[PDB]
Design a binder for this molecule. Structure first.
Ligand SMILES: Nc1ncnc2c1ncn2[C@@H]1O[C@H](COP(=O)(O)OP(=O)(O)OP(O)(O)=S)[C@@H](O)[C@H]1O
Ligand SMILES: [Mg+2]
Length: 252
């Protein structure tokens, strides 16, 4: 379903309270933060605590999709619309109807698609590729990004009108290095996940934890999770001390 946002930091306690406020509303939510800072966790929780909780949760990875197939991927197509179209699609939007659409890295959505997304947010309608059957769509938008959208507006790479439409309820995720007090609790959570799934077990002694609390965590919680996995393989059911950490994680 959805996992919980572990932590005792002021910043994370804020996020939970903001989540509870906006969740069972239909406001568009924009979640900002570095890679691996729990942005999808926040999005999934928002959904399953929402009026749409029994509806579908439909991700769109704005980075991945090739722009040639992008409009098609998001809005579907009747067959004939272009080449090779001999089986048809409802787009990610139609698939999300009565549910939540999670736009992962909205900063990577190309300008022409930003315009079409604004239409959905405004007119709540859309066109399948090559069609004129203006179908209506009933989705809640949650978007996430690690980019500086306001700068992109200035650069002309992101639309101001879309921005103000999407950024009704922003939620900022603090990077791990700004919430180091949470690292021990995160470890406990990550190790407990690992045990539940028969994938191993470790624990960290206080020396190791101190050193981890001084790490920069450019990959944030996903990097933290990666280190836990690796240490469980190298030292199964072992205790991790400063010496068992890789050199880049030692800070003494
Ligand atoms: N506060 C948290 N409590 C528990 N698990 C967390 C927390 N923050 C992140 N995680 C976990 O850390 C991993 C990465 O979190 P995600 O939500 O996928 O990150 P993200 O911000 O969406 O980064 P990207 O854009 O997908 S790289 C997942 O396995 C999450 O379950
Ligand atoms: Mg993600």
């Amino acid at each position: 379903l959805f996992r919980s946002l572990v932590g005792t930091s002021r910043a994370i306690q804020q996020v939970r309270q903001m989540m509870q406020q906006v969740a069972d509303t239909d406001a568009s939510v924009l979640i900002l933060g570095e890679s691996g800072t729990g942005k999808e966790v926040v999005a999934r929780n928002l959904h399953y605590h929402s009026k749409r909780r029994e509806g579908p949760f439909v991700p769109v990875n704005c980075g991945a999709i090739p722009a040639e197939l992008l409009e098609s991927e998001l809005f579907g197509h009747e067959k004939g619309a272009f080449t090779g179209a001999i089986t048809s699609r409802a787009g990610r939007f139609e698939l999300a109807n009565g549910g939540t659409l999670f736009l992962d890295e909205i900063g990577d959505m190309p300008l022409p698609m930003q315009v079409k997304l604004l239409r959905v947010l405004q007119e709540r309608t859309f066109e399948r590729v090559g069609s004129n059957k203006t179908q209506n769509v009933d989705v809640r938008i949650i978007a996430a990004t690690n980019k500086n959208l306001e700068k992109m507006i200035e650069d002309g790479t992101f639309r101001e009108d879309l921005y103000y439409r999407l950024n009704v309820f922003p939620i900022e995720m603090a990077p791990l290095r700004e919430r180091v007090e949470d690292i021990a609790l995160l470890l406990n959570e990550l190790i407990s996940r690992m045990e539940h799934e028969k994938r191993g077990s470790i624990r960290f002694n206080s020396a190791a934890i101190m050193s981890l609390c001084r790490h920069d965590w450019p990959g944030n919680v996903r990097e933290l999770a990666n280190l836990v996995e690796r240490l469980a393989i190298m030292h199964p059911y072992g205790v991790i001390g400063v010496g068992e950490l890789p050199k880049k994680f030692r800070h003494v």
